Structures are given as structure tokens and as C-alpha cells.
Amino acid sequence: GREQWASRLGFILAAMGSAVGLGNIWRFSYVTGENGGAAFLLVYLGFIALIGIPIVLAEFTIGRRAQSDAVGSFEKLAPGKPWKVAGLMGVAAGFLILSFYGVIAGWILFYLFNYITGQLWSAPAEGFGGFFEGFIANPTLPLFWQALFMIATIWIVAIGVKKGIERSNKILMPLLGVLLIALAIYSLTLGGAKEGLAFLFSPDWSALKDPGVYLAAISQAFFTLSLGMGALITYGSYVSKDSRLPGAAVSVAGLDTAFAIIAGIMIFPAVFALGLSPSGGPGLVFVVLPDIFDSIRLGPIVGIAFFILLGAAALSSAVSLLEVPVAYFMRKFDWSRKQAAITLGVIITLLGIPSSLSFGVLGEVTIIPGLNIFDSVDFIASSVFLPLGGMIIALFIGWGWKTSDALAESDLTDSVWGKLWILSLRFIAPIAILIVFLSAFQ
Ligand SMILES: CCCCCCCCCCCCO[C@@H]1O[C@H](CO)[C@@H](O[C@H]2O[C@H](CO)[C@@H](O)[C@H](O)[C@H]2O)[C@H](O)[C@H]1O
Ligand SMILES: CCCCCCCCCCCCO[C@@H]1O[C@H](CO)[C@@H](O[C@H]2O[C@H](CO)[C@@H](O)[C@H](O)[C@H]2O)[C@H](O)[C@H]1O
Ligand SMILES: CCCCCCCCS[C@@H]1O[C@H](CO)[C@@H](O)[C@H](O)[C@H]1O
Ligand SMILES: CCCCCCCCS[C@@H]1O[C@H](CO)[C@@H](O)[C@H](O)[C@H]1O
Ligand SMILES: N[C@@H](Cc1ccc(F)cc1)C(=O)O
Numbered sequence: 001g002r003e004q005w006a007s008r009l010g011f012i013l014a015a016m017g018s019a020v021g022l023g024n025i026w027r028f029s030y031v032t033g034e035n036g037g038a039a040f041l042l043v044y045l046g047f048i049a050l051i052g053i054p055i056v057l058a059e060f061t062i063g064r065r066a067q068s069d070a071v072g073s074f075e076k077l078a079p080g081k082p083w084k085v086a087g088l089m090g091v092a093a094g095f096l097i098l099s100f101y102g103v104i105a106g107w108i109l110f111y112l113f114n115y116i117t118g119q120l121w122s123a124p125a126e127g128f129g130g131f132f133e134g135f136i137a138n139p140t141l142p143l144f145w146q147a148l149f150m151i152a153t154i155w156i157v158a159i160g161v162k163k164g165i166e167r168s169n170k171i172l173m174p175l176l177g178v179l180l181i182a183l184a185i186y187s188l189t190l191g192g193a194k195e196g197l198a199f200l201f202s203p204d205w206s207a208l209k210d211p212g213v214y215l216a217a218i219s220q221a222f223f224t225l226s227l228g229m230g231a232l233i234t235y236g237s238y239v240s241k242d243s244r245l246p247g248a249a250v251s252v253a254g255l256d257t258a259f260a261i262i263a264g265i266m267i268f269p270a271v272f273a274l275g276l277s278p279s280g281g282p283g284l285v286f287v288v289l290p291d292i293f294d295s296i297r298l299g300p301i302v303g304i305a306f307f308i309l310l311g312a313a314a315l316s317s318a319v320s321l322l323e324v325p326v327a328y329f330m331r332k333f334d335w336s337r338k339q340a341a342i343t344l345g346v347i348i349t350l351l352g353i354p355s356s357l358s359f360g361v362l363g364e365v366t367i368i369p370g371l372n373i374f375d376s377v378d379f380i381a382s383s384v385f386l387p388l389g390g391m392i393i394a395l396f397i398g399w400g401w402k403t404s405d406a407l408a409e410s411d412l413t414d415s416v417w418g419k420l421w422i423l424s425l426r427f428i429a430p431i432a433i434l435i436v437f438l439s440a441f442q
């Protein structure tokens with residue numbers, strides 16, 4: 001007896017609650033900042049349109065048709081065929097992403113706690129930068145908040161699809177959006193807008209002569225859409241034929257892009273206002289945003305509201321991360337949902353511990369050459385497993401399915417849009433992924 005979404009809106013809100021999270025505010029800010037701004041942004045937007053939306057609809061189609069996990073969907077639909085390595089890669093991508101995703105989500109909790117206990121109301125004597133560096137370098141303090149966030153994620157995944165994942169507050173996501181628009185409006189009035197908006201929207205094409213910017217653009221695209229690791233195959237496996245998938249794919253990609261763009265209009269005028277470099281790195285928003293909340297009279301409550309709504313977005317994103325291997329181990333080992341969520345959840349928490357330490361005592365340690373542990377596991381997950389698993393997912397429908405079945409299961413016809421969707425799964429998206437892989441790694 002497999003689970004289904006109880007409500008009709010349950011599927012689209014789950015997929016939206018999974019795509020909109022830390023990647024839109026935290027990750028989109030520091031990757032766009034260190035990749036130059038507008039030229040990376042255009043490549044990113046182009047990848048969202050011509051690669052992201054089709055592969056999202058591909059994941060939806062695969063999951064609903066098979067009614068099975070990330071891996072089981074390929075076993076079921078193509079028995080004995082090697083397409084299930086994408087689900088396998090997707091499962092491993094969940095262990096890795098959620099490991100460090102919970103570290104960054106723990107930072108949200110720590111800042112939330114400091115705004116409840118009235119600590120970060122005024123600037124600390126070491127500044128907002130030094131406050132952040134001292135917290136993340138601390139060996140044990142980030143672990144406490146990381147484990148705290150993981151317990152919240154395990155709890156919801158253990159409760160189930162009907163009573164846990166789907167019972168997410170329908171108001172927190174539109175409230176996060178209203179606050180980002182209000183805050184993007186405020187930072188436009190701080191003095192660095194002309195330089196922040198030019199950085200964000202006036203392209204410097206000299207950046208685009210670097211293979212790494214395309215690789216960072218395709219990774220941020222796959223990351224922010226919860227794409228390439230079967231998470232949308234999993235959420236699609238709980239929906240019935242009473243659903244139109246193409247509108248869901250466009251809506252998730254459209255809304256998810258709206259957050260990142262607005263998050264950019266909020267962050268970068270503030271960065272140039274504070275005279276800060278756009279390449280600050282992973283802790284950019286954690287240094288820039290507390291400064292912004294300090295310049296506001298009612299700023300403490302803004303930070304309280306911001307880190308509540310942001311953590312809620314991270315909470316629902318982590319739930320879809322954990323649900324991917326959990327659905328695997330429920331079928332594969334006949335584990336119960338509570339046993340798999342707790343076991344895998346505790347394990348993934350341990351996996352992220354070296355990522356948390358790599359901001360401090362393990363900062364000198366590297367795995368892949370020139371990247372620390374956090375950046376090494378983020379790289380192989382976001383830059384290797386997510387884009388390759390997406391490429392295989394696209395070739396699966398484009399070349400392993402009959403055209404009529406691909407169109408019928410995705411609620412498309414042989415119209416211009418159906419032909420267009422089949423064209424990008426068959427050629428545009430996988431070849432673009434291929435060219436980005438080839439040009440980046442020599
Ligand atoms: C967000 C909602 C989550 C609900 C869970 C509620 C958890 C409540 C338990 C709080 C435990 C905090 O634990 C305690 O936090 C304070 C900060 O306030 C730390 O404070 C310490 O760390 C910082 C480093 O950033 C030092 O600069 C500071 O001088 C020092 O006092 C303590 O070393 C730690 O022992
Ligand atoms: C409440 C619903 C939320 C949804 C949308 C809300 C939008 C929020 C807009 C807040 C933007 C405030 O932006 C802030 O406004 C005042 C002017 O009003 C500016 O203040 C500036 O102009 C005013 C008057 O011209 C002077 O008092 C001040 O000396 C000067 O610094 C701030 O430099 C600017 O940072
Ligand atoms: C609200 C979204 C609109 C943001 C658009 C900003 C992108 C173009 S900025 C533009 O860059 C030029 C040189 O780069 C300067 O000559 C101009 O003074 C300046 O206007
Ligand atoms: C709680 C709602 C806050 C929404 C976020 C927008 C922040 C803008 S607040 C703004 O800060 C100024 C100081 O520059 C005050 O002088 C103004 O009176 C006040 O309007
Ligand atoms: N898409 C989420 C992160 C994510 C969730 C689920 C995934 F399967 C992958 C990635 C974000 O942008 O924060």
C-alpha cells in the first residue's frame with residue numbers, strides 16, 4: 001500500500017516546497033557573486049528554461065508513471081536496463097547534499113536563536129562578519145543546531161507523506177516571498193543599487209570565456225530545481241493521473257526563479273552598500289543580511305521573521321532530500337518509514353559533521369584538489385551527480401521511450417510544445433550538459 005497525496009494541491013505545493021529553499025537565497029547569492037553576476041545569471045536563466053523545465057517534467061512523468069522510488073522507477077519502467085544508475089546516483093546525491101544542507105540550515109537556527117534571545121539586535125563588537133566566523137569555526141556549536149534541524153527533518157519524514165510532508169503550512173512560502181520583496185525594495189534605497197543592479201543585470205561577457213561559469217550555472221540550475229536526483233521522481237510517484245504535470249513543471253521553475261532573482265535584488269545592492277566584495281563566499285548572506293537588519297529600526301523582528309520563514313523553506317527542502325533515500329530503503333530493505341527516516345537521518349547527520357568542521361579545524365583539509373570538505377562534497381554532488389543524473393533522466397525519455405508514451409504520460413500532445421519538449425530531452429539538454437562537462441574538465 002503505497003502513499004498518495006491526500007489533497008489535490010498537495011503535489012504542486014510539495015514540489016514547490018522542495019524547490020524553494022536555501023539554494024535560492026544562500027546558494028544563489030554566493031555562486032552568482034563569485035561567478036561575476038549578470039553573465040552567469042543569463043546562462044543560469046537559459047539553463048533553467050531549456051534544460052531545467054524539460055527535465056523537471058521528465059522527473060514528474062517518470063515518477064507518476066512508475067509509482068515507485070528514484071531507483072525503482074527505472075527498474076519498473078526499464079527492467080534489466082542501465083538507466084537505474086541515475087536513481088542510484090540520485091540516492092547518493094541525497095546523502096551528500098542533505099549532509100551539508102543541514103549544516104547551513106543549522107546556521108539559520110543559530111541566528112534565529114540569537115534574534116529571539118535579543119543578541120544580534122545591535123552589532124557585536126567584532127562586527128557581523130567576525131560574529132559569523134567565530135560561530136562556524138566553533139567545533140561543537142554548529143553541530144548542536146545541525147542535529148536540531150535534522151531531528152525536525154527526520155520527524156516529518158517519519159510521520160509520512162499524508163500527515164507529514166503534505167501538511168506543510170501553505171502560508172509560510174508566500175510569506176517568505178512577501179518578505180523578500182519588501183527587503184529587496186529596502187536594499188535598493190541604501191546607496192549601492194546602481195552598482196548592485198549593474199553587477200546583477202549588466203553582463204560582462206569576459207566571464208563567459210571560462211568553462212567554470214557554465215558548470216557553476218548548470219549546477220545552480222539543477223540544485224535550485226531539486227533536479228537530477230529523483231526527488232521530483234519521488235514526489236511525482238505519490239500523485240495520481242488527476243494532475244497536469246506540464247503546468248506543474250512550469251510553475252515550480254517559474255516560482256523558484258522568482259525567489260532567486262528577488263533574492264539577488266535584495267543581496268547585491270546591500271553588498272555594494274556595505275562596500276563588501278561580491279565573492280565573499282558561503283557565508284555571504286549571513287554577513288550581509290544581519291547588517292541590513294541592523295540599519296532598520298524594527299530590524300530585530302525582521303530578522304526573527306526572516307530566519308523563521310527561511311528555515312521553514314529549508315525544512316521542506318531537506319524533507320524532500322531525506323525522502324529520496326528513505327523511499328529507497330523502504331522498498332529495498334523492507335524497512336519501516338520510521339526506521340529508515342531515523343537511521344538514514346542520523347547517518348546523514350554524521351556525514352555532515354566533517355562539512356561543518358571544514359569551516360574551522362578542518363579548513364586546511366582538502367579532498368578534491370584545492371577544495372575543502374564542504375566544497376568537495378558540494379562539488380561532486382551539485383556539479384557531477386546532479387547534472388549527470390539529469391542527463392541520463394533526459395536520455396531515458398528521449399531515447400528509451402516511444403514518443404507517443406512520453407507525450408501521453410506527460411499530458412502533452414504532438415503539438416509544438418510536445419515536439420519542443422521531446423527535442424530538448426533528446427538533444428538540447430543532454431548535449432548542453434555534455435558540452436559543459438567536456439569544456440570544464442579539460
Ligand atoms: C531556533 C529554535 C530552536 C529551538 C531549540 C532551542 C535551543 C536552546 C539551547 C541553546 C543552547 C546554546 O548554547 C550556548 O549558546 C551560546 C550563544 O548564545 C554560546 O555562546 C558562546 O558561543 C559564541 C560563539 O559564537 C561566543 O562568542 C560566546 O562568547 C559564547 O558565550 C554557548 O557556548 C553555548 O553553550
Ligand atoms: C509593510 C509591507 C511590506 C511590503 C513592502 C514594503 C516596502 C518597504 C519599503 C521600505 C524602504 C525604506 O527605505 C528607507 O526609506 C527612507 C525614506 O522613506 C530613506 O531615508 C532617506 O530619505 C528620508 C526622506 O527622504 C530621510 O528621512 C532620510 O534622511 C534619508 O536617509 C532610507 O534611506 C531608506 O533606506
Ligand atoms: C530593476 C532592474 C533593472 C536593473 C537594470 C540595470 C542593468 C543596466 S545598469 C546600467 O549600466 C551602464 C554601464 O554598465 C550604466 O551606463 C548605466 O548608468 C546603468 O544604468
Ligand atoms: C516590519 C516591516 C519591515 C519590512 C522590511 C522593510 C524595512 C524598511 S523599515 C524602515 O527603516 C527606516 C530606517 O532607515 C525607518 O526610518 C523607517 O521608518 C522604516 O519604514
Ligand atoms: N532545491 C533546494 C535544494 C534541494 C532539495 C531537494 C533536492 F533533491 C535537491 C536539492 C534548494 O534550492 O534549496
Ligand code: NA
Nearest residue numbers: 019023024224
Ligand atoms: Na531553489
Ligand code: NA
Nearest residue numbers: 017020313317
Ligand atoms: Na523548501
